[PDB]
Design an enzyme around this catalytic site. Structure first.
Site, PDB file in Angstrom:
ATOM      1  N   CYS A 110       0.827  -1.204   0.000  1.00 57.85           N
ATOM      2  CA  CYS A 110       0.000   0.000   0.000  1.00 57.85           C
ATOM      3  C   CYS A 110       0.863   1.256   0.000  1.00 57.85           C
ATOM      4  CB  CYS A 110      -0.902   0.016   1.240  1.00 57.85           C
ATOM      5  SG  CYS A 110      -0.010  -0.165   2.821  1.00 57.85           S
ATOM      6  N   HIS A 132       1.537   5.572   9.320  1.00 58.47           N
ATOM      7  CA  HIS A 132       0.591   4.547   8.932  1.00 58.47           C
ATOM      8  C   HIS A 132      -0.463   4.149   9.956  1.00 58.47           C
ATOM      9  CE1 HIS A 132      -0.978   1.084   6.868  1.00 58.47           C
ATOM     10  NE2 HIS A 132      -0.095   1.183   5.892  1.00 58.47           N
TER      11      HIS A 132
END
Lengths: 330, 330
Positions: free
Chosen positions: A149, A176
Site C-alpha cells: 500500500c 501509517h
C-alpha cells in the site's frame, strides 16, 4: 470476464472482493480460508471501517450466493489442493500474506490456476507492479506482486517529481494506520518487539521496505530512497511524508502544477491532487492510491522540500490489485 | 414544501442539513451561526464520521450554493434579528443549545418564523415530542423540543414493552459516545467535573435526564424509570441498556416477537429489530432512533429482563428532528 479466486479473506481479501462487485471485467467465483461459509458472509456483511455491504449475500449448501451469483467457499490449508480450475479461476488473489514467494505461490497454478497476484511485496525476487509507475514493464509472468500500500503511494508521486526535477536523494516517513498484524494491548511480536505494543496507546516506530522497493518499480530511482514508519492509532488511511533533494530548482507553485498535471492526465485515477484542508478520514474509501496534499507540504528552498500524499491503505490498494489482475490478463 | 432555517451549524445542525437533502416535503433555506460561508462549506464538505457531503457546495457572494440551491448565510448572535421571513422560513431548527426555553426560542418567531423545534431538551416546560411515543399528542404548539437522542431511543422501546407487558419499574444505562461538550485531554467543566476529563482516555460516568424524560413523553411511566450514562471513547453511535420488571410474565422469545411486531408494525422507521451479531459502528448512519438487539439482551426470569437497543445519536435524532418539523406543520 476474468475469473478470480481469493485466497485469504482478511482485510485485503474482503475489500478487493467488495470493490470487484462494481467492476464488469472481473468475477469472483471462489474464496478459500479457514472460515465457515456463514462466518464469511458476516465478515462481508458488516465492516467497522467501510459500513455495511452494498449488496445481497446468503449462505446455501455450504457456499455463498452474493448478488445472485454462487461463490465457492473452501477451507484448504494447502493451496496446491484448491482445484481452482474446477470453478475456472483465471487469476488467484494470494491475500494470505503467507505465500509471497514463487515456490509457495506457484502451488496455486499447480492447482489448476492460470496466474497468481500477490497482494503484498514478494519475499523472493517475484516482480512487483505499481499502477502509474511500472505497469508497462509486465512481461507475461504468471506470478506477480502488487507490492504494498505504501509503495503504491510513493512510487506514483516519486515518478512525477523525478521526471520533473530529478530526485537526487530522498528519505520517506509513513505515518501509517493500525493493521491486523498489531495488538490491542502489549502482546507477543517475536520478530518485531515494538509491533506487539498496545496499538491504540502508542505511536510505534516501524520499518518499511517501501522506499527501497520504489527503486525496484522505478529503476531510475534505485538507491536514491529509503525510509521508515510510525504506526499510529487510527483504523484506516495512512500518509507519506517525503523529504527530497531536487536536481532541478523548482518553486512550490511549480511542484504543485506538475503533480496536478499528472493527476489530471497521465496519472488520472492513480495519483490525486487537492488544496483543501483535509485530514485522514477524508480519504476513507479513496480509490486513488496517492493523493497529493498541496497545503500540507513545505519547502525549505528550491532544491529541498517535504511533500505529503494520502492513501487509504485498504481501498486504494485493493482496487489497484484488481487493476493488475485485469492488466496481466489483457 | 416546508421552509427550514437552521440556527446553529454544530453536529446536529450539520447532520440535519444533510439528511434534509434526501427529503422532499422540507427545504433548507437559511443557516445562521458565527462562521464564514466558506468555513460553513468546509464543515459540510468533510465529515470525519459520515463521509464527504454527497452533493455540491460552493460559495456565491457570501452565501452557499448546495446542490444548486442558494442557502442564506448569516452570523447573528441575537435570534430576533434573523429576519426569517425575508427567506420565507416556516420552521426553525434551534440547534445552538443556548435557546431551550420559550422566551429564547420565541425570538425566532419574533424574527418572522412560524414555529420552532429545539434540537435538545427544553430548559423549561416547553413540550417535548418523540416519534413513536407521543407525536399524536401534538396540539398546534408553536415552540417544541425533539427531546434528546437517548430519549428518542428509550421512549419507543419503553412504550412497546409497557404497552405489552407493563413495566412496574426499570433502571437504564446508556453507553454513549463522546460529544462536542467533552474534552480531548483533562480540561475545564465547571458544572461537570467528570465530563471534563480526557474523553479518549476514560469511561466517564455521567448524568442523563433521559429516563425521567420518558416519564414526561410517556406519562404512564412517570416515576417508573430513571438512569445514567457512561461516556466511552467512540466518535458516534450509542446504546441503551434497560433493566426492567414486567407485570405480565413474558419469555424473551415473546419480548422479541412483540418488539419485532412494533418494528414492522406501528413503529416502522422509528423502531428497528435485528438478531445479528452487531457492534456500534454497524449503526453509524442509522435512521431508526431505536434498534432492538435481540441477541444482546438477557433475562433472569419472565419478570426481570435487560434489553439493549442501538441509536446513532447524530443521524437518528436528526432525521426525527425533520419528522417533527413536518409533523408540526400538518
Amino acid at each position: 470476464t476474468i475469473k478470480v479466486g481469493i485466497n485469504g479473506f482478511g482485510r485485503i481479501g474482503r475489500i478487493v472482493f467488495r470493490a470487484a462487485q462494481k467492476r464488469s471485467d472481473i468475477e469472483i467465483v471462489a474464496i478459500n480460508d479457514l472460515l465457515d461459509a456463514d462466518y464469511m458472509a458476516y465478515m462481508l456483511k458488516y465492516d467497522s471501517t467501510h459500513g455495511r455491504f452494498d449488496g445481497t449475500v446468503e449462505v446455501k449448501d455450504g457456499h455463498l450466493i452474493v448478488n445472485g451469483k454462487k461463490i465457492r467457499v473452501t477451507a484448504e490449508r494447502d493451496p496446491a489442493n484448491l482445484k481452482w480450475d474446477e470453478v475456472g479461476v483465471d487469476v488467484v488473489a494470494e491475500a494470505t500474506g503467507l505465500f509471497l514467494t514463487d515456490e509457495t505461490a506457484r502451488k496455486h497454478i499447480t492447482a489448476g490456476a492460470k496466474k497468481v497476484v500477490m497482494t503484498g511485496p514478494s519475499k523472493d525476487n517475484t516482480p512487483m507492479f505499481v499502477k502509474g509507475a511500472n505497469f508497462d514493464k509486465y512481461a507475461g509472468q504468471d506470478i506477480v506482486s502488487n507490492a504494498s500500500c505504501t509503495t503504491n503511494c510513493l512510487a506514483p508521486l516519486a515518478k512525477v517529481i523525478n521526471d520533473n526535477f530529478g530526485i537526487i536523494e530522498g528519505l520517506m516517513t509513513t505515518v501509517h494506520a493500525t493493521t491486523a498484524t498489531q495488538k490491542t494491548v502489549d502482546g507477543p511480536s517475536h520478530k518485531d518487539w515494538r509491533g506487539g505494543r498496545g496499538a491504540s496507546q502508542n505511536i510505534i516506530p516501524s520499518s518499511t521496505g517501501a522506499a527501497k522497493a520504489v527503486g525496484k518499480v522505478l529503476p531510475e530511482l534505485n538507491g536514491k530512497l529509503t525510509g521508515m514508519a510510525f504506526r499510529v492509532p487510527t483504523p484506516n488511511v495512512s500518509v507519506v511524508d517525503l523529504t527530497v533533494r531536487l536536481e532541478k530548482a523548482a518553486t512550490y507553485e511549480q511542484i504543485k502544477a506538475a503533480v496536478k498535471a499528472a493527476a489530471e492526465g497521465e496519472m488520472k485515477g492513480v495519483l490525486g491532487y487537492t488544496e483543501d484542508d483535509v485530514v485522514s478520514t477524508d480519504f476513507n474509501g479513496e480509490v486513488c492510491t496517492s493523493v497529493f496534499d498541496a497545503k500540507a507540504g513545505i519547502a525549505l528552498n528550491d532544491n529541498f522540500v517535504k511533500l505529503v500524499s494520502w492513501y487509504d491503505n485498504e481501498t486504494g490498494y485493493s482496487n489497484k490489485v484488481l487493476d493488475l489482475i485485469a492488466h496481466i490478463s489483457k
